[PDB]
Design an enzyme around this catalytic site. Structure first.
Site, PDB file in Angstrom:
ATOM      1  N   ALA A 162      60.882   9.456  -4.841  1.00  0.00           N
ATOM      2  CA  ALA A 162      59.824   9.312  -5.834  1.00  0.00           C
ATOM      3  C   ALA A 162      60.110   8.145  -6.790  1.00  0.00           C
ATOM      4  O   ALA A 162      61.256   7.761  -6.990  1.00  0.00           O
ATOM      5  CB  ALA A 162      59.669  10.618  -6.567  1.00  0.00           C
ATOM      6  N   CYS A 182      59.832  13.415 -12.887  1.00  0.00           N
ATOM      7  CA  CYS A 182      61.230  13.813 -12.840  1.00  0.00           C
ATOM      8  C   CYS A 182      61.761  13.690 -11.420  1.00  0.00           C
ATOM      9  O   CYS A 182      62.822  13.105 -11.246  1.00  0.00           O
ATOM     10  CB  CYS A 182      61.453  15.257 -13.267  1.00  0.00           C
ATOM     11  SG  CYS A 182      61.537  15.552 -15.056  1.00  0.00           S
ATOM     12  N   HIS A 183      61.050  14.248 -10.430  1.00  0.00           N
ATOM     13  CA  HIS A 183      61.525  14.157  -9.059  1.00  0.00           C
ATOM     14  C   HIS A 183      60.393  13.711  -8.144  1.00  0.00           C
ATOM     15  O   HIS A 183      60.554  13.678  -6.926  1.00  0.00           O
ATOM     16  CB  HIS A 183      62.240  15.449  -8.626  1.00  0.00           C
ATOM     17  CG  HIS A 183      63.217  15.952  -9.643  1.00  0.00           C
ATOM     18  ND1 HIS A 183      62.838  16.726 -10.728  1.00  0.00           N
ATOM     19  CD2 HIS A 183      64.545  15.754  -9.785  1.00  0.00           C
ATOM     20  CE1 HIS A 183      63.894  16.994 -11.475  1.00  0.00           C
ATOM     21  NE2 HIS A 183      64.950  16.406 -10.920  1.00  0.00           N
ATOM     22  N   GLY A 184      59.253  13.373  -8.752  1.00  0.00           N
ATOM     23  CA  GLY A 184      58.092  12.840  -8.057  1.00  0.00           C
ATOM     24  C   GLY A 184      57.431  13.855  -7.131  1.00  0.00           C
ATOM     25  O   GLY A 184      57.444  13.713  -5.908  1.00  0.00           O
TER      26      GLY A 184
END
Ligand code: CDL
Ligand code: PC1
Ligand code: PTY
Ligand code: PTY
Ligand code: HEC
Ligand code: HEC
Ligand code: HEM
Ligand code: HEM
Ligand code: AWB
Ligand code: FES
Lengths: 54, 244, 111, 85, 383, 244, 54, 85
Positions: free
Chosen positions: B148, C76-78
């Protein structure tokens, strides 16, 4: 060695007094002995070993 | 679960403090404090540690007071009831880089850097986890991991994608004792420091445990002699039976 | 628009969803969804998406309108949430929880 | 069911002579070496099966289960995992 | 007449700790009783001390525990002693119950001490669960959330009951304050029941490893068992010392050193190790209500051992088949423990169900069958 | 001690709420709130009372929400972690005139106006003390009293010199119900209001006590019948003695 | 009146059932009766008496 | 010193016949009016002095002390107060 028994062991009052006095002495000496031992096995590691730089 | 989801489990490194008889290396702790102060403290707080806690561990009273006195802390209001600041004292807690969570997350692309006072006890692995994490950012994420945006690949972190970037590079700190500040050296030092922060009694605890082990061992040996002595009448008993 | 109401410290996302937004959400086949649910299960009123705006992964707050399924993106973690607030991509296991909310009036809800 | 000293509720005893010696007259550690080696070996050998059988079986069960679980969550085990769910 | 017998107060101490007539052949497994008494005393001493430093308010609880660790003289010791002794309490209690099952301490005439014992075991579980919550770390919170949501499965009233226990709509400040008060109280209730099971036992006296009467050959509790109990006290304190001083966090979960955060859920919520077998039993049943009933039944089913053991002989010392069955039962109980801490994944789901069926079938099928067959083997075999 | 040092003890006024069966007059409570809000609240806080507490006592839900919504309270910080204010809600506490003690004392020539949430229980006398104090400022201090600077003479206050000036004068408040706002009327109203603030359960408490008194009286009567019934064998016992 | 005894009192199960049913009825009626009485002796004083103005 | 039913530790009793009637056969309130008035009067009269003498003395003491104290802290009592300190 009868003498030793008669003085320190025969009377319980004496035995308990001897135990408590021994406990006092053991406690004091054991503290000091562990302190020195601990300082030798952890040499150069503790604060007291590096404090001199400051 | 996938091993990815768990995180790679950290190696068991031989820390100076591992071993029933071993204290922390306090010179390492002092070096580690310097890493915390120059690198981590930008994002992470150490809220449970007061300046007084460094005294006689890493710093003399004078050095620690100097660190406290450089900062400003909230005083009681003045006589007109206006707010005031004072210089720090030894009883003050080491102040955080952010006033609140929201400020912290806004500065870190949503991620909240945790407080590090307990992090060594709050993760499986302890010092080894912190060491592994800080040293375990690969140059390139394994092909086919999709990170991400604003994530960094780190295999030791559960899930793989951590919001904390690699931060330790050779010579980001200049140690005051002339030790070469390599990535690995700094990670070792700071991980030791954080371990101390989480458990500051560790040295005292293990010395008293040595005393306790010795006394309780002796008393165990003696208790067995005494039990066998008092029980010998019963164990030694013999019978002769004459049916009536 | 999406509002953020604190309710027991947790943020509450309230989005006033448009017609085309509702349509976009009603598309995705339930089958292909970590947490399989349709918008009708989530909202009691199609114009009021009310969720507990805590990401189901670890517990960061998703930035709304961002994403890849244009709903909510946890930075935060996508992890990407939908216009129903369903998880589509990223580490998060569940869809953004729905509080017990009731429309006392048509202009006021209690949570 | 159980009384007290002097009316414990034993059936009447008669014709047993019991003998013992003082703790100060005995060696409390007499034949300790022999007992620690030969007696403990005897007693352990006699009870070994009752421990070894269930422990070895449940260890084997766990080992099979943990190895399967590990294998299912590898790349190789993707398909078998898909069926198992 | 001697003062210890004449004076009514002294006489009660005398009857329990000094002239109490015991079998002369109790082995080391009879020492867990006194170790459990030692755990209970350590928990009262450390517990009362922690209460002098703990603050039950949710804004301050976690910080008060850090204050104990960091500021209070010897606070670290009192905290770790209390936390680890809770683990040792359950090692000793499982040992003590194991001893009672193996040696048939539950049979007549000792059904009453056994049955009160099963209640002591329930109170210990509740006590230790509430104490866990007081830290107000992440395991504290998420433990209280999940466990109190099981009560929601009680039909019709369940939801209302949960909100009533929490004092709110979620686990928060009211919950924490009430668990503090209850956790303080429960150990005193537990001590009273511990004393009741002893008073109940006094009518029959202790069983013994041979399972025969000891009425023929008794020994005063002191000095013989006094000094025998010291051996295990010192052995226990050696084990205690290794954990408390050298590895204080080996038995614990690091997640409890993160402050409770109702938003963030921890990676994995698993209970403290000693609850794990019951947790595995609960997971085995797919139904929520079914699971809860099974979990409670896993404890209450101990109360039927006096009925389902049909043996004419007390205990297992002389029963080779019963010994094998008991070994399988105990190992299965440990496997349940281990399955309580794996993830809910194949193949552990099916395995957990098999172990749960084995657990119940011991009481309901195997023990009644095996004990009936052994009766016949003893009689025919000795003709 | 001298009577001066103790303070004059207040008269016993017949408050509506005195009397085992009597509630507060809620119309007086509402009038009293208006006095608090327009006169006392300038210097005194009411920190233990929330807006929700007035609802169904003195105000409807709508009136109380209106009062709350006119104020600003501290919110949680925004997403950039900047501080924010919000409009008040029913769960909010009635806010003080001063941020802290120091501000309070600076505004009152050193004296600290106490919080009034408990003042009716925190002084000997209760409502009577509050009523007596507010109405008991003489036009002229008794000749020969030496007042410290910034002190006012009031005989009900211990020592005589109070840092609070006379504040109630005819028509400082305009009551919304057309009641003439005389010094004594306003003191009666505000004293009732403060008594309610100290003990908000007072009405419920005395109703449950009436129920309890009735049940416990009946059970006392019945318990005596039952005791005498069960004891009659023993009381009625007679003996016949024939020495053997 | 023998009938009354036989039905409600003779069996303890019946007596305790009668007591509890009576307790339920007493509790409910006494609550209502006190409420009305309390409202009459405190007339024009309570919130419910002034609420109509708002 | 005290036993239990059947061996209470009474000296042997003989030749006392005790009689009573059932609680259901008695009027529990029989002669209550007479007792409440005449019996209570008798019992109170007999014990009156043991209460009245000490209470009246200690009340008088308190009254004298409280009146003196009050008088000492008036203007009139200034001088007597000065001496008393
Ligand atoms: C926890 C806190 C720490 C405190 C310590 C308490 C633990 C003490 C205790 O109860 O266990 C010791 C206990 C010694 O008790 P004991 O009084 O010597 O004999 C009790 C049995 O009758 C002994 O049974 P036995 O006479 O038939 O001897 C059996 C025992 C040999 O017993 C020993 O002496 C060891 O050997 C084994 O069963 C070993 C298993 C073989 C696997 C390899 O050891 C065992 O019995 C271990 C076997 C349990 C399975
Ligand atoms: C692990 C599996 C346990 C199997 C034990 C089988 C018997 C054995 O060999 O033990 C040695 C000994 C055998 O002792 P024994 O008394 O049967 O025999 C002594 C020697 N003879 C036969 C000559 C008289 O057994 C014990 O001492 C067993 C105590 C049981 C404790 C179990 C604790 C488990 C917790 C679960 C709680 C629910
Ligand atoms: C209540 C909790 C009970 C658990 C006891 C375990 C050990 C705790 C002792 C604390 C400790 O660290 O003591 C060490 C020595 O251990 C020891 O020597 C203690 C181990 C000995 C076993 C216990 C014997 C009796 C203890 C229980 C009695 C308590 C109440 C009755 C009056 C070293 O500490 P230190 O030597 O620096 O200490 C200063 C005196 N120099
Ligand atoms: C924890 C610390 C352990 C206790 C330390 C006590 C010192 C022991 C030495 C004293 C001793 O041997 O003398 C006996 C005292 O034992 C006694 O009178 C006590 C004997 C053993 C005490 C422990 C009893 C069970 C312990 C397990 C704990 C119980 C659970 C509750 C927490 C006298 O007695 P004698 O009759 O042998 O003298 C024979 C002649 N007069
Ligand atoms: C400029 C940012 C930044 C710097 C510099 C930084 N960190 Fe972090 N750190 C973070 C953020 C953001 C997270 C949370 C990552 C996440 O949750 O995805 C984090 C997480 C951690 C964690 C916990 C990871 C976990 O398991 O939850 C540890 C340990 C850690 N940091 C230690 C350090 C140490 C040691 C240093 C430097 C010596 C350091 N950090 C420097 C931002 C930083
Ligand atoms: C502008 C200032 C001011 C106003 C207006 C004011 N007060 Fe005060 N009040 C004080 C100060 C200052 C004190 C404390 C005086 C002292 O301790 O000497 C005080 C004290 C009191 C005390 C406690 C006296 C004690 O025994 O300690 C009561 C009760 C009180 N006020 C009630 C009221 C009420 C009711 C009103 C108006 C309806 C009111 N006050 C108006 C400033 C004020
Ligand atoms: C605080 C918890 C407990 C304490 C302090 C305690 C203590 C003791 C003690 C001192 C004895 C006598 C000595 C011995 O046999 O070990 C005993 C016996 C017994 N206990 Fe426990 N106990 C506890 C919990 C339990 C539990 C949970 C059970 C049962 C589930 C139980 C059942 C028994 C039985 C049946 C006996 C009689 C055993 C026998 O001697 O044959 N107790 N207990
Ligand atoms: C059977 C007795 C007891 C058991 C099994 C028990 C168990 C526990 C446990 C498991 C915890 C969580 C420990 C942690 O991880 O930190 C705890 C905490 C606590 N217990 Fe107890 N406890 C007992 C008795 C008591 C008593 C009598 C008190 C008296 C108040 C008490 C006070 C506390 C306090 C204040 C805490 C919170 C501080 C802390 O976590 O250390 N406990 N207890
Ligand atoms: C002081 C008098 C008050 C009576 C109660 C105090 C305790 C008491 O009775 O002690 C005894 C020493 C007892 N042990 C045994 O029965 C025992 C019997 C046979 C063999 C062995 N072991 C073998 O070698 C034993 O260990 C024990 O530890 O039970 C505690 C739990 C009791 O505490 C209470 O119930 C009160 C409260 C603190 C729980
Ligand atoms: S915390 Fe929401 S994406 Fe990981």
């Amino acid at each position: 060695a009868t003498t030793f028994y008669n003085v320190f062991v025969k009377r319980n009052s004496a035995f308990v007094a001897t135990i408590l006095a021994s406990a006092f002495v053991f406690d004091m000496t054991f503290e000091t002995a562990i302190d020195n031992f601990w300082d030798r096995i952890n040499a150069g590691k503790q604060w007291k070993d590096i404090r001199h730089k400051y | 679960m996938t091993a990815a989801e768990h995180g790679l489990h950290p190696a068991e490194y031989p820390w100076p403090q591992n071993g029933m008889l071993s204290t922390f290396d306090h010179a390492s702790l002092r070096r580690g404090y310097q890493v915390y102060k120059e690198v981590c403290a930008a994002c992470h707080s150490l809220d449970r540690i007061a300046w007084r806690n460094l005294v006689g561990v890493t710093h003399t009273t004078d050095e620690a007071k100097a660190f406290a006195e450089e900062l400003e802390y909230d005083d009681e209001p003045d006589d007109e009831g206006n707010p005031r600041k004072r210089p720090g004292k030894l009883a003050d807690y080491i102040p955080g880089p952010y006033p609140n969570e929201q400020a912290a997350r806004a500065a870190n692309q949503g991620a909240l850097p945790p407080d590090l006072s307990l992090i060594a006890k709050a993760r499986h692995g302890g010092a080894d986890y912190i060491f592994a994490l800080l040293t375990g950012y690969p140059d390139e994420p394994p092909a086919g991991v999709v990170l991400a945006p604003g994530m960094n690949y780190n295999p030791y972190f559960p899930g793989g994608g951590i919001g904390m970037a690699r931060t330790l590079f050779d010579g980001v700190v200049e140690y005051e004792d002339g030790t070469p500040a390599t990535t690995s050296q700094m990670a070792k030092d700071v991980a030791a420091f954080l371990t101390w922060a989480a458990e500051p009694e560790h040295d005292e605890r293990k010395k008293l445990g040595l005393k306790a082990i010795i006394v309780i061992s002796a008393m165990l040996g003696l208790s067995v002699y005494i039990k066998k002595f008092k029980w010998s009448p019963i164990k030694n008993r013999k019978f002769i039976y004459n049916p009536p | 628009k999406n509002v953020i109401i604190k309710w027991r410290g947790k943020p509450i996302f309230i989005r006033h969803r448009t017609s085309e937004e509702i349509e976009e959400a009603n598309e995705v086949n339930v089958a292909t969804l970590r947490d399989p649910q349709t918008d009708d299960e989530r909202v009691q009123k199609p114009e009021w998406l009310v969720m507990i705006g805590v990401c189901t992964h670890l517990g960061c707050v998703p930035i709304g309108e961002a994403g890849d399924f244009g709903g909510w993106f946890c930075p935060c973690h996508g992890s990407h949430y939908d216009i129903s607030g369903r998880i589509r991509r990223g580490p998060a296991p569940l869809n953004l929880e729905i509080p017990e909310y009731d429309f006392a009036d048509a202009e006021t809800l209690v949570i | 069911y159980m009384g007290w000293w002097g009316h414990m509720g034993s059936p009447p005893q008669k014709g047993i002579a019991g003998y013992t010696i003082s703790p100060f007259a005995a060696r409390p550690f007499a034949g300790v070496v022999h007992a620690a080696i030969f007696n403990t070996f005897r007693r352990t050998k006699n009870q070994a099966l009752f421990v070894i059988l269930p422990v070895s079986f449940f260890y084997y069960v766990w080992t099979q289960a943990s190895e399967k679980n590990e294998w299912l969550y590898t790349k190789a085990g993707r398909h078998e995992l898909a069926k198992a769910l | 007449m001697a003062l210890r017998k004449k004076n009514s107060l002294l006489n009660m101490a005398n009857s329990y700790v000094l002239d109490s007539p015991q079998p002369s052949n109790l082995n080391y497994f009879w020492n867990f009783g006194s170790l459990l008494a030692l755990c209970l005393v350590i928990q009262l001493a450390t517990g009362i001390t922690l209460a002098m430093h703990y603050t039950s308010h949710a804004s301050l609880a976690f910080d008060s525990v850090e204050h104990i660790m960091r500021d209070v003289n010897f606070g670290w010791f009192i905290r770790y002693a209390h936390a680890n002794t809770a683990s040792f309490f359950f090692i000793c209690i499982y040992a003590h119950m194991g001893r009672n099952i193996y040696y048939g301490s539950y049979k007549t005439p000792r059904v009453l001490p056994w049955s009160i014992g099963v209640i002591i075991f329930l109170l210990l579980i509740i006590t230790a669960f509430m104490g866990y919550v007081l830290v107000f770390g992440q395991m504290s919170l998420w433990g209280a959330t999940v466990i109190c949501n099981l009560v929601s499965a009680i039909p019709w009233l369940g939801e209302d009951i949960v909100h009533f226990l929490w004092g709110g709509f979620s686990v928060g400040n009211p919950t924490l304050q009430r668990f503090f008060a209850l956790h303080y109280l429960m150990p005193f209730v537990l001590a009273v029941f511990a004393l009741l099971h002893l008073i109940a036992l006094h009518t029959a006296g202790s069983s013994n490893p041979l399972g025969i009467t000891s009425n023929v050959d008794k020994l005063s509790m002191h000095p013989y068992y006094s000094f025998k109990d010291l051996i295990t006290v010192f052995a226990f304190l050696l084990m205690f010392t290794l954990f408390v001083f050298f590895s204080p966090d080996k038995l614990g979960h690091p997640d409890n050193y993160i402050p409770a955060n109702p938003m963030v859920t921890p990676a994995s919520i698993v209970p403290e190790w000693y609850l794990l077998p019951f947790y595995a039993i609960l997971r085995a049943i797919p139904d929520k209500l079914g699971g809860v009933i099974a979990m409670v039944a896993a404890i209450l089913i101990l109360l039927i051992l006096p009925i389902v053991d049909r043996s004419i002989i007390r205990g297992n010392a002389f029963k080779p088949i019963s010994k094998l069955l008991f070994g399988f039962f105990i190992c299965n109980f440990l496997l349940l423990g281990v399955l309580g801490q794996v993830h809910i994944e194949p193949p552990f789901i099916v395995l957990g169900q098999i172990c749960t069926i084995f657990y119940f079938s011991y009481f309901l099928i195997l023990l009644p069958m095996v004990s009936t067959i052994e009766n016949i083997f003893f009689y025919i075999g000795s003709l």
